[PDB]
Amino acid sequence: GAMAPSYRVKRMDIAKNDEECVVNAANPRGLPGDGVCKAVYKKWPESFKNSATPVGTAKTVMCGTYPVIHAVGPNFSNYTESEGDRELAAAYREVAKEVTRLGVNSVAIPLLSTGVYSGGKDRLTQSLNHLFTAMDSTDADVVIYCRDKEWEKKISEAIQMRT
């Protein structure tokens, strides 16, 4: 575990993370996709061997010895608010099981279902709170990766409010 498990946020490409493993914002079919998933495909293409996995689950595939945890958040276009909420919470619970199983001391995570799967809605708070619910019981250092300057500030504020 980390000596003093923390949350941090950085505004940069998750493919340039400084952590012991990465969470992909995957699609259920293990396709290269767009956004985080396309950056992850360019950096760790070997990790997409048999990565397909249903909505609300996580499947880890090794790129060398570097673990890529494919986490499949719901597409809020296709899901109701209620069912989407349940699957988004579940995806993060499966990420917490994988991070624990791998025995890593740190993980790079994106906010699931906040990009092209958001159904056109701002889901920073919803996705972040499900991330916290899952990861709070883990002792990995969690580093959240975002690209928008205003999201960095809001994620930083939410982390600092609980410290």
Q: Are 81 and 122 in contact (CB under 8 A)?
A: no
Report the 10 Å Cβ neighbour count for 26: 29
Biggest distance spanned by C-alpha atoms of the chain: 41
Q: Which residue's CB is nearer to Cl ion, number 34 or number 139?
A: 34
Q: Which residue's CB is nearer to Cl ion, number 104 or number 111?
A: 111
Nearest-CB residue for Cl ion: 115
Instruction: Supply the minimum distance, in Å, between the C-beta of residue 4 and Cl ion.
Output: 26
Binding of Cl ion by 11 (CB under 5 A):
no
Cβ-in-10-Å burial (0-12, 13-18, 19+) of 65 comes to exposed
Which span sits near Cl ion by CB under 5 A: 10-18, 41-49, 88-96, 136-144?
10-18
- Angle (nearest 5°) at CA 96 between 93 and 102: 145
Q: Which residue's CB is nearer to Cl ion, number 106 or number 151?
A: 151
Rounded distance between C-alpha atoms, residue 74 and residue 26, angstroms: 10
Residues 85-144 that bind Cl ion (CB under 5 A): 115, 117
Applying CB under 5 A, which of residues 98, 151, 155, 158 lies at the interface with Cl ion?
151
